[PDB]
Amino acid sequence: IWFEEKLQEVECEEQRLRKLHAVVETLVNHRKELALNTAQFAKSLAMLGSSEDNTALSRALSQLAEVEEKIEQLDFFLLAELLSDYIRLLAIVRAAFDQRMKTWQRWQDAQATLQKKREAEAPDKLQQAKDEILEWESRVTQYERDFERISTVVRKESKDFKNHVIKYLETLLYSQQQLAKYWEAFLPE
């Protein structure tokens, strides 16, 4: 048995990856919202610009619609989705370890009962003790059966992911720093 160790590993990775997920999810959601709000803005500007009678206002609205689009265009999401699924899988493996534990216990207790039934044997009360052992060996074999099944399912069922997140974060940071430097110098006023 190594199950104790392999559970502690899984328990650890699940705690580590859930933390990373919370970082990846704030990054994925922000980029998602920005491309969403910008596409609405651009559509709204083009519609307003189309329905404008003043030529100067009309051109300005439609040119700004064209701009929000060009700038919007200016991989991490695949890594993000692989992470979300892997987290869900770790939850299934731990539930399997939990199942294995509870199934193992039902068996051990039945095994203990059976053993007390055998000590109890060591006329009509002797016949009752005999039929008791036949009912508990029936139970004990099925409970070991239930256990073996779950252990097979368990057998069948982070710090690499993290580096990739750091890489994306650093380039995002740099890119944003350059935009802050540009706006601080060029802010229209």
Place this chain on the structure above:
Amino acid sequence: SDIWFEEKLQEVECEEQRLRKLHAVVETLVNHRKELALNTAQFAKSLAMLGSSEDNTALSRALSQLAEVEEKIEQLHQEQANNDFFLLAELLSDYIRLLAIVRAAFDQRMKTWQRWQDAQATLQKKREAEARLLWANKPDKLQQAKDEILEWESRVTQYERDFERISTVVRKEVIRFEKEKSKDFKNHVIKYLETLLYSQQQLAKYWEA
């Protein structure tokens, strides 16, 4: 006279239709720069919290440095927000609300004027009713026609007073409209829009290198 009044409702109805159109443009511009500074302050707070609760030094620094950057970016959206624009937006939203009040006042004036004209018409039919009953009949019904005329005179003078009162309120509100009409919102919005456009165009050109 009562010709200046009908000409004023024409100008007001027009400006209200024109400014509501402009408002819809200003409101999409105000709402976008509102949401951006909002979402960014939310993002920065979340990044700082996540960065504070991170055990990996490289990841922790990256999250907190990005929070410091989006903090700076938020203040730049706050600096251009408090622009001569976001101020014009509040002036436009209020002026639109005032134009709605002036039209409601013109409406009140119209309905008040009509109550009076109809009472004036009734009164005039009551006077014709005396001309008939005078020689052509007896003082019994002639007394009823006299007291009718005194009740409708009472009404007609009061209704003309009510009308005069509403026309004064319309004149006063016509003065408020003019002070906030002589503000030329349309060219200010265009001016802003063109600088916003230019600014965005220069960012697109700069980012290419």
